[PDB]
């Protein structure tokens, strides 16, 4: 997956759960509490593209870009320790000056695989 | 329930999930992580008696006393924030020098009701 992230051929089929404000910029418990809020709120099926250019989510049904996140503003990402396909990341929304947690359910992979790929995107972006 | 605890007429129908060692003597996250371990392990149905004399669990099927916990060695108790009928307490097992979390599913009540009754038992025992 590292070469795929570098080459911009890394994508995962996901259900995007939305986002929710959090008050810490990192932490697995922080992400898991956010995921609980997201789950208690209909997930949108799409493709999560992971590259040094950003995390982009494209909706399967409309083919529209619904998440376009620069890597430089993502602080932390993690698999959900309690759900094997769960994944989230925390980012800084500079326009509202908030930390936001974006949540996912991976359709075909472990949440750990998604987290490792986003960690690769951290490394690639810094390299560049 | 306070008068019932003082009078030794306070009992709740429960499923007893067992116990597991923990490394802190208090905390809702500590209890919830312990409950997760207990749930990932067949619960025993019985009656949880709450009084200044102890927390006693009697198995419905054998009528045997399977938990007999003095109040003085119980440090903390809490409802499960993620399951309305979940309840646990942490106690000191002096013979093995361990903190142990004992977990329950209330059959007919909220976990908050059980926790409030055990908190009453704390007060009654100290009073006496």
């Amino acid at each position: 997956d590292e070469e795929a992230v570098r080459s911009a051929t890394c994508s995962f089929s996901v259900k995007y759960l939305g986002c929710v404000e959090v008050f810490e910029s990192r932490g697995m418990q922080v992400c898991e509490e956010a995921l609980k809020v997201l789950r208690q709120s209909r997930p949108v099926r799409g493709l999560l593209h992971v590259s040094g250019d950003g995390l982009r989510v494209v909706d399967d049904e409309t083919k529209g870009l619904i998440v376009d996140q620069t890597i430089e503003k993502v602080s932390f990402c993690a698999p959900d320790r309690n759900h094997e396909r769960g994944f989230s990341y925390i980012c800084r929304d500079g326009t509202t000056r908030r930390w936001m947690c974006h949540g996912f359910l991976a359709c075909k992979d472990s949440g750990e695989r998604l987290s490792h790929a986003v960690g690769c995107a951290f490394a690639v972006c810094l390299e560049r | 329930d306070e008068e019932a605890v003082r009078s030794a007429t306070c009992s709740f129908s429960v499923k007893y999930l067992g116990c597991v060692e923990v490394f802190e003597s208090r905390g809702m996250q500590v209890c919830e992580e312990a409950l997760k371990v207990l749930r990932q392990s067949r619960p025993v149905r019985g009656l949880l008696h709450v009084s200044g004399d102890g927390l006693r669990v009697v198995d419905d099927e054998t009528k045997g006393l399977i938990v007999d916990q003095t109040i003085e060695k119980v440090s903390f108790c809490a409802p499960d924030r993620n399951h309305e009928r979940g309840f646990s307490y942490i106690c000191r097992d002096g013979t093995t020098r361990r903190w142990m979390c004992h977990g329950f599913l209330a059959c007919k009540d909220s976990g908050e009701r059980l926790s409030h009754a055990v908190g009453c038992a704390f007060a009654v025992c100290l009073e006496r």
Binding site: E72, S75, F76, S115, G119, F122, C125 | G18, V20
Partner: peptide
């Protein structure tokens, strides 16, 4: 004690800016 239960990938972004 037969009621006792015995006990048995995240990344920070160094380029956060």
């Amino acid at each position: 004690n037969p009621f006792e239960v015995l006990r048995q990938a995240c990344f920070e972004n160094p380029g956060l800016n």
